[PDB]
């Protein structure tokens, strides 16, 4: 909600399924999802840094936190996403932009700033924001794909908050991840 990932999520929806669309309300919900995940991972990573007595946060600390928060299936896929993002970043030779060098739709540079702003750690690495950024993009795409399946079941091409909530409740894996998060309830 604090950031503006509505445009970014829209791009993901186009690549994952041009036919299916997303409502402006649904986009806003996705924005809050990114903020919620960032806070949980950030706090968990900070705790790990203290245990290792390392002021600078790196991909290793994030990797442990990612597995603990994400179920078994999601955790395995998450490793490839963050690892590849770091490799791609390292692979690129000419590139002055962090996001461009990493090849991530989400603002990689912004993520790095958020970690430092959160006062979680005195110093933040480059491979860390890239790793986290890759995980966030994966979650965004996964939610959109599941929502599309529910939309088809309801004979609707557009994705609405009802579809998003239905998809999360349709799979225990996401339910566990969002167990402490409520999309919208009285």
């Amino acid at each position: 909600r604090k950031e503006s990932y509505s445009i970014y999520v829209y791009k993901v929806l186009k690549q994952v399924h041009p036919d299916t669309g997303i409502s402006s309300k649904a986009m806003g919900i996705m924005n809050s999802f990114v903020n919620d995940i960032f806070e949980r991972i950030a706090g968990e990573a900070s705790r790990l840094a203290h245990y290792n007595k390392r002021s600078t946060i790196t991909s290793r600390e994030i990797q442990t936190a990612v597995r603990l928060l994400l179920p078994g299936e999601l955790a395995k896929h998450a490793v490839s996403e963050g690892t590849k993002a770091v490799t791609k970043y390292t692979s690129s030779a000419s590139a002055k932009t962090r996001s461009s060098r990493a090849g991530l739709q989400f603002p990689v540079g912004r993520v790095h700033r958020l970690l430092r702003k959160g006062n979680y750690s005195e110093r933040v690495g480059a491979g860390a924001p890239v790793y986290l950024a890759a995980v966030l993009e994966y979650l965004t795409a996964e939610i959109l794909e599941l929502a599309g399946n529910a939309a088809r079941d309801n004979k609707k091409t557009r994705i609405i908050p009802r579809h998003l909530q239905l998809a999360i409740r349709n799979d225990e894996e996401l339910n566990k991840l969002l167990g402490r998060v409520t999309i919208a309830q009285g």
Binding site: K11, A93, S94, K96, T97, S100, Q105
Partner: protein
């Protein structure tokens, strides 16, 4: 006046510009649509490279025109 900009991937985007509009201005617009740096983008008309400092009128481009997109590679 409107023009169509196609890319080597096979994608096409409609763009509204006037004969007096500069290429540099178009580069920024493309960045908004793709999210790719304007320096790393090349615009071609009738298979001819286009200069940023030059205007559309310079290449004698009329209404309904097709422009192709290429990628610039430089280490800055």
């Amino acid at each position: 006046m409107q023009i169509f900009v196609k890319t080597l991937t096979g994608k096409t985007i409609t763009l509204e510009v006037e004969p007096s509009d500069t290429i540099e201005n178009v580069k920024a617009k493309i960045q908004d649509k793709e999210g790719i740096p304007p320096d790393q983008q090349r615009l071609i008309f009738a298979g001819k490279q286009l200069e940023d400092g030059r205007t559309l009128s310079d290449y004698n481009i009329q209404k309904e025109s097709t422009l192709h997109l290429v990628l610039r590679l430089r280490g800055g």
